[PDB]
RNA sequence: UUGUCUAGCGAGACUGCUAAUGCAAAUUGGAGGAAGGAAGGGAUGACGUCAAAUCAUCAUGCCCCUUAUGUCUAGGGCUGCAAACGUGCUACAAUGGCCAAUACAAACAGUCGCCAGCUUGUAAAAGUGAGCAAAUCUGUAAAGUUGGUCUCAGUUCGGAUUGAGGGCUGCAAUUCGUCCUCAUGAAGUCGGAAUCACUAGUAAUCGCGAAUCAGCUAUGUCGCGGUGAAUACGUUCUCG
RNA sequence: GGUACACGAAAAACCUUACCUAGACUUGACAUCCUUGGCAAAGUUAUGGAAACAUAAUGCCGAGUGACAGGU
């Protein structure tokens, strides 16, 4: 499934290593980014419109 | 195609002032390291000075003169068969490939220390008995039968 | 002296807005107190985050984004509360935070 | 164990040409007996040729080292044990994947025709 | 008085001070001779190519401090500082020194590599 | 394929939708994951609001959200009919103790937003209204409103199986390879009885001479 | 393998063994932990371990028991060298 | 052995000048400069193309399931296995192997954290104890050099596999984490057929940081930094 | 094939996860449309049990009924 994974993620386990990070609006544990509790596709799409304050296209 | 592009120039050696020795520096250089190559350089000159003492230079450009090539091979086709004929080539590439032959035949030795085997191929080449001059003889000799398209170069 | 060692750190994620905020605050504090040292330029915390573009098979076609955080320092030993009052006339914009001790 | 000496070289590397004592345990024996290998000579004293064997046997016996190691191997073999079960029949047991490797325990190659048309 | 010189190479720099005093000077850096800081190798003549090709070392000191980089870039930086001091002291030699191409460093630094690259130009070994 | 030009001018010419920061990966993640949904609310909730944009402003755990539209006549509400519902949903979305307030206004030249035109054409799609009339109306409206040449394209079901027809229209200059253009882009997915229709609108506000600083 | 607990049992085997060693005459025990490793005082029994397909009941050795109980039985099914 | 350094505002190269040849455009040299003919690089992909890829990001038209393709945890599996490909790593070596001493950074991150440091240890680490919410605290940079040994051979090469023991996290390391100490020492003598990448800071080589994550045989990924070459004659062929 | 094969999948020992099997599970684990509740929702522990999970109190708070959601 897809939604029940999100539901069980937001729960509280009994051991401290059960937790797995994902995004909360569009979560994808596959290639997870815990830098901001987001996902790679999610960060990419929000960056296009500019929904993140500090997001910029990389300049060298 | 490649329109026009001048190549890089070498700098005079601070202790030899010889373009030939700079090309030696370049050819024996491996892994982007100068100091290790420079150690081999110092050992080579010192040992050439040590065993049968002469003048590092005199024997050096003597060997360079002996290994001077004549004709370099290039291949043409009728789209179905390769024919190899030799043409001319400037002096810089001649010297570079001659010193490359020297270094390659140097590394393909089986004595213990590098410095002594290096001095060995150098004195052998200066004596017209090393392996470096053999391929020059071969590239001069093949023109006996490759004259058919050495006449007309395309 | 009234409140020694006003060491206020300002944080923003840009350099141009950093320039604006620094100019604003270090020129509004003039007019009321003396002995203000120059704002020392500080290195920028750069973060490059390389990101896969396609949702499928490629690791070569990855873009990359930037996040740069900036900061400036104000070290004030000999001051009066006049500068503290002056801090409440023109507000720093919402993208800049303050650190104090 | 046995009696072995290098061709003509330092005393310590004789410990390398005997089993059960690699380079590390060699240096261990040296720092235990305070005997350092003098330059390219295997003859300094005559009593050392049994003195070193005393501490070597004190550690354990070479042939017996491998004897009880093989005994441990057949001990995994005798009783039902997955480690021993895979170890007995020429197959790796650790985290190594057996689909592109393990050849050193397999002979050089035993390749046969495959069916990639399907 | 002293001659303010600055040399730059491979994101490394060097401040250079020379004096017209009555001392011939002693080449040194990092409070040690270059024979011990720089490699004790061919670079001994490399770091003093201009001063041994023009304005022999008999009328100035060596007060050079380095910052950053490896060691070859340090040699380039100190040489750039030397030529800067030589130019500011005697600019009349400007014509005879620029032919040697002892001018500023030519910005050759390691590139800023990208995704799909191994040396900023090396490819991922294209296959079938 | 290509990338939206709104990000190509974001960070050097375009204003930030949100201006705030906090301790790294401690509460920044939670704050952004809340206010992004806060931002996404209104366009999903409302289709007849022609809302221009929303703006998040956070100041050390003090949060507020400006909203700007074209005509707030249906957004202010009779005796604050809408504002009470807005306050209720704001208390619903982001906590109960945080300070919550806003004001609704109109930005200068509200006609130059791609979002309102994209919503208008989406209405033209969801209402089973033909395509040509919508396209010609958009073209004539953007021509007579007063602006430089814009462009637009559509993709999706056009009342026919085997979707391989998509139409694009462009006028004037649309320099997608130019740093300073100040040109807005919108993308909308309208729901129809045959599937989803994706429409892209590039509206040209106009290049501003010597743009040396953010507007 | 814990270096602090000689063989880290999940501690739910303790209930089963304090039952069994007291009963000590019905060798099959309905308990299964692939992570269980018996101590010298939990030796001389069979273990009904669920492979995830079937409940295999096998007897345990009395000499080296410092190994995973699931390591004395195959974890899955295998086959010979591939020819089909 | 103090105004380098961090970084804002700018200046600064624009065929700007000249000889040169040309209707114009534009051409090669010289002066100069920090740099001369898109100063070096990134960032910026037109129409289409193969209906290539994703109805498993998402939204989603069909059809179907529904006391069931919905839920919750145990455990097993995504890691096997004659083979072959695709990619690394690292050897087949005295430019090297090991041993002692010694030269030197950038960035970058660090709050349940970064871990100075002390003591216990051959070691994984442990008890302990400062600064750092970060230009003050932290993270042996190595190649190099001084040498010493190995003395030219299946080697102190190569380190695989397996074995014993110790170490950490993790409810737990069997499936299928990994580190270190000790034991053994696999093929292997530069890899035909064919190929792949590369125009100077390039290739090659050497080290540092960040990443998901409790930790992790990621040699991989992302970058940072150090040393640092060769050939470019040329477009008959070969690919576009 | 070019245009997959250090890929999706920047972490497969619980989770990761879709799957083989065990236990339960049904206007529903989760959420929404009705009406009644403004304080008890977690957790807690011997209870059986490999494991969900029920008996004992503790500490947007909430019941039933229908309106169904979800499908890696």
Curated annotation (Swiss-Prot), chain A:
* Species of origin: Mycoplasma pneumoniae (strain ATCC 29342 / M129 / Subtype 1)
Q: What does this protein do?
A: Binds 16S rRNA, required for the assembly of 30S particles and may also be responsible for determining the conformation of the 16S rRNA at the A site.
At the highest ranks, the source species' classification is: Bacteria, Bacillati, Mycoplasmatota, Mycoplasmoidales, Mycoplasmoidaceae
Give the similarity note. Answer: Belongs to the universal ribosomal protein uS14 family. Zinc-binding uS14 subfamily.
Residues the entry annotates as binding Zn(2+): 23, 26, 39, 42
Q: Which InterPro entries match?
A: Ribosomal_uS14, Ribosomal_uS14_bact, Ribosomal_uS14_CS, Ribosomal_uS14_sf
Annotated cofactor note = Binds 1 zinc ion per subunit.
Its quaternary organisation is: Part of the 30S ribosomal subunit. Contacts proteins S3 and S10.
* Official protein name in the record: Small ribosomal subunit protein uS14
Q: Which UniProt keywords apply?
A: Metal-binding, Ribonucleoprotein, Ribosomal protein, RNA-binding, rRNA-binding, Zinc
Q: Which cofactor does it need?
A: Zn(2+)
Gene Ontology terms: cellular component: cytoplasm; small ribosomal subunit
SUPFAM superfamilies named among the record's database cross-references: Glucocorticoid receptor-like (DNA-binding domain)
Single annotated GO MF = structural constituent of ribosome
Q: Which GO terms describe its biological process?
A: translation
Curated annotation (Swiss-Prot), chain B:
Q: Does the keyword Nucleus apply?
A: no
Q: Can you supply one Gene Ontology CC term for this chain's record?
A: small ribosomal subunit
Q: Which InterPro entries match?
A: Ribosomal_uS7, Ribosomal_uS7_bac/org-type, Ribosomal_uS7_CS, Ribosomal_uS7_dom, Ribosomal_uS7_dom_sf
Q: Its Gene Ontology biological processes? A: translation
State a single Gene Ontology molecular function: structural constituent of ribosome
SUPFAM superfamilies in alphabetical order:
Ribosomal protein S7
Instruction: Tell me yes or no: is Manganese among this UniProt entry's keywords.
Output: no
Q: Which UniProt keywords apply?
A: Ribonucleoprotein, Ribosomal protein, RNA-binding, rRNA-binding, tRNA-binding
Pfam families recorded for this chain?
A: Ribosomal_S7
> What Gene3D superfamilies does the record point to?
Ribosomal protein S7 domain
Q: What does this protein do?
A: One of the primary rRNA binding proteins, it binds directly to 16S rRNA where it nucleates assembly of the head domain of the 30S subunit. Is located at the subunit interface close to the decoding center, probably blocks exit of the E-site tRNA.
Subunit: Part of the 30S ribosomal subunit. Contacts proteins S9 and S11.
The record's comment on protein family reads:
Belongs to the universal ribosomal protein uS7 family.
Q: Which PANTHER family match?
A: RIBOSOMAL PROTEIN S7
Q: What is this protein called?
A: Small ribosomal subunit protein uS7
- The record lists the organism as Mycoplasma pneumoniae (strain ATCC 29342 / M129 / Subtype 1) (Mycoplasmoides pneumoniae)
Swiss-Prot record, chain E:
Q: Has UniProt tagged this entry with the keyword Ribonucleoprotein? A: yes
Query: GO terms for molecular function, please?
Result: RNA binding; structural constituent of ribosome
Q: Name one GO biological process term.
A: translation
One GO term of the cellular component aspect? cytosolic small ribosomal subunit
Question: A Pfam family this protein belongs to?
Answer: Ribosomal_S9
Keyword Cytoplasm among record annotations = no
- Alphabetically list the UniProt keywords: Ribonucleoprotein, Ribosomal protein
Name the PANTHER family for this protein: RIBOSOMAL PROTEIN S9, SMALL RIBOSOMAL SUBUNIT PROTEIN US9M
Q: Which NCBIfam families match?
A: PRK00132.1
Q: Could you tell me what this protein is called?
A: Small ribosomal subunit protein uS9
Where does this protein come from, organism-wise?
Answer: Mycoplasma pneumoniae (strain ATCC 29342 / M129 / Subtype 1)
From Swiss-Prot, chain G:
Single GO BP term = translation
Q: One Pfam family from the UniProt entry? A: Ribosomal_S19
Highest taxon in the source lineage:
Bacteria
Any GO MF annotation of the entry? rRNA binding
Listed A to Z, the keywords are: Ribonucleoprotein, Ribosomal protein, RNA-binding, rRNA-binding
Looking up InterPro entries in the UniProt record yields: Ribosomal_uS19, Ribosomal_uS19_bac-type, Ribosomal_uS19_CS, Ribosomal_uS19_SF
Coiled-coil residues are none
Under Gene3D superfamilies, the record lists: 30s Ribosomal Protein S19, Chain A
KW RNA-binding (keyword) present: yes
Q: Does the keyword RNA-binding apply?
A: yes
Q: Could you tell me what this protein does?
A: Protein S19 forms a complex with S13 that binds strongly to the 16S ribosomal RNA.
What family is it from? Belongs to the universal ribosomal protein uS19 family.
Q: What is this protein called?
A: Small ribosomal subunit protein uS19
Source organism per entry reads Mycoplasma pneumoniae (strain ATCC 29342 / M129 / Subtype 1)
């Amino acid at each position: 499934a897809k939604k029940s994974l999100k539901v069980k993620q937001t729960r509280i386990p009994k051991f401290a290593v059960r937790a797995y990070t994902r995004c909360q609006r569009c979560g994808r544990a596959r290639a997870v980014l815990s830098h901001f509790g987001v996902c790679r596709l999610c960060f990419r799409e929000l960056a296009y419109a500019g929904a993140i304050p500090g997001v910029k296209k990389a300049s060298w | 195609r490649k329109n026009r592009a001048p190549k890089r120039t070498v700098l005079p050696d601070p202790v030899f002032n010889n373009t030939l020795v700079t090309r030696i520096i370049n050819v024996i250089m491996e892994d982007g390291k100068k100091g290790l190559a420079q150690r081999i350089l110092y050992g080579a000159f010192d040992l050439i000075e040590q065993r049968t003492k002469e003048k590092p230079l005199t024997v050096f450009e003597r060997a360079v003169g002996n290994v001077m090539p004549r004709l370099e091979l290039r291949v043409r086709r009728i789209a179905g068969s390769n024919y190899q004929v030799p043409t001319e080539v400037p002096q810089d590439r001649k010297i570079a490939l001659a010193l490359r032959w020297i270094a390659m035949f140097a590394r393909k030795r089986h004595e213990k220390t590098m410095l002594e085997k290096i001095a060995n191929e150098i004195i052998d080449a200066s004596n017209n008995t090393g392996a470096a001059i053999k391929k020059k003889d071969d590239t001069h000799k093949m023109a006996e039968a490759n004259k058919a398209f050495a006449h007309m170069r395309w | 002296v009234k409140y020694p060692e006003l060491k206020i750190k300002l944080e923003s994620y840009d350099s141009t807005l950093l320039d604006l905020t620094t100019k604003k605050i270090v020129e509004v504090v003039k007019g009321v107190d003396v002995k203000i040292k120059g704002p020392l330029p500080l290195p920028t915390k750069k973060e490059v985050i390389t990101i896969i573009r396609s949702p499928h098979v490629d690791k070569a076609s990855r873009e990359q984004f930037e996040k740069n955080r900036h900061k400036r320092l104000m070290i004030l030993v000999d001051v009066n509360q006049g500068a503290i009052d002056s801090l409440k006339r023109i507000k720093i914009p919402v993208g800049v935070t303050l650190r104090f001790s | 164990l046995g009696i072995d000496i290098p061709n003509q070289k330092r005393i310590e590397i004789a410990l390398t040409y005997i089993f059960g004592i690699g380079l590390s345990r060699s240096q261990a024996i040296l720092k235990q007996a305070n005997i350092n290998p003098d330059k390219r000579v295997k003859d300094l004293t005559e009593e050392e040729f049994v003195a070193i064997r005393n501490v070597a046997s004190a550690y354990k016996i070479e042939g017996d080292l491998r004897r009880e190691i093989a005994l441990n191997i057949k001990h995994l073999s005798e009783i039902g044990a997955w480690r021993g079960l895979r170890h007995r029949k020429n197959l790796p047991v650790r985290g190594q994947r057996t689909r592109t490797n393990a050849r050193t325990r397999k002979g050089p190659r035993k390749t046969v025709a495959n069916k990639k048309i399907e | 008085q002293s001659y303010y010189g600055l040399g730059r190479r491979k994101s490394s720099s060097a401040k250079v001070y020379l004096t017209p005093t009555q001392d011939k000077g002693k080449i040194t850096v990092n409070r040690r001779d270059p024979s011990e800081y720089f490699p004790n190798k061919l670079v001994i003549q490399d770091m003093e190519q201009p001063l041994d090709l023009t304005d022999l070392k008999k009328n100035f000191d060596i007060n050079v401090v380095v910052k950053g980089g490896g060691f070859t870039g340090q040699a380039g930086a100190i040489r750039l500082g030397i030529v800067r001091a030589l130019l500011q002291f005697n600019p009349e030699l400007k014509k005879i020194l620029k032919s040697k191409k002892l001018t500023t460093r030519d910005k050759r630094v390691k590139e800023r590599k990208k995704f799909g690259l191994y040396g900023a130009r090396r490819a991922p070994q294209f296959t079938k | 394929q290509k990338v939206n030009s709104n990000g190509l001018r974001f960070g050097i010419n375009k204003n930030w939708i949100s201006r705030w920061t906090a301790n790294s990966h401690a509460q920044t993640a939670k704050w952004l994951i809340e206010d992004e949904k806060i931002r996404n609310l209104f366009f999903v909730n409302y289709r007849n609001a022609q809302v221009s944009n929303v703006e998040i402003e956070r100041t050390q755990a003090t949060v507020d959200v400006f909203v700007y539209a074209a005509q707030p006549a249906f957004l202010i509400g009779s005796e604050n009919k809408n504002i009470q519902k807005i306050t209720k949903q704001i208390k619903q979305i982001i906590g109960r103790t945080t300070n919550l307030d806003l004001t609704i206004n109109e930005i200068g030249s509200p006609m130059l937003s791609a979002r309102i035109i994209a919503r208008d054409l989406a209405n033209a799609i969801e209402a089973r209204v033909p395509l040509r009339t919508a396209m010609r109306q958009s073209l004539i409206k953007v021509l007579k409103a007063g602006a430089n040449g814009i462009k637009v394209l559509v993709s999706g079901r056009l009342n026919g199986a085997e979707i391989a027809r998509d139409k694009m229209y462009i006028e004037g200059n649309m320099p997608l390879s130019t740093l300073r253009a100040d040109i807005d882009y919108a993308l909308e997915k309208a729901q129809t009885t045959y599937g989803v229709i994706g429409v892209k609108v590039w509206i040209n506000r106009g290049m501003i001479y010597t743009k040396g600083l953010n507007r | 393998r814990s270096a602090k607990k000689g063989a880290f049992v999940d501690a739910h085997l303790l209930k089963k063994v304090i039952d069994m060693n007291k009963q000590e005459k019905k060798r099959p025990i309905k308990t299964w932990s692939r992570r269980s490793t018996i101590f010298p005082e939990f030796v001389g029994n069979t273990f009904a371990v669920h492979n995830g397909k079937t409940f295999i009941n096998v007897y345990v050795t009395d000499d080296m028991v410092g190994h995973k109980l699931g390591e004395f039985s195959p974890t899955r099914n295998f086959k010979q060298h591939t020819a089909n």
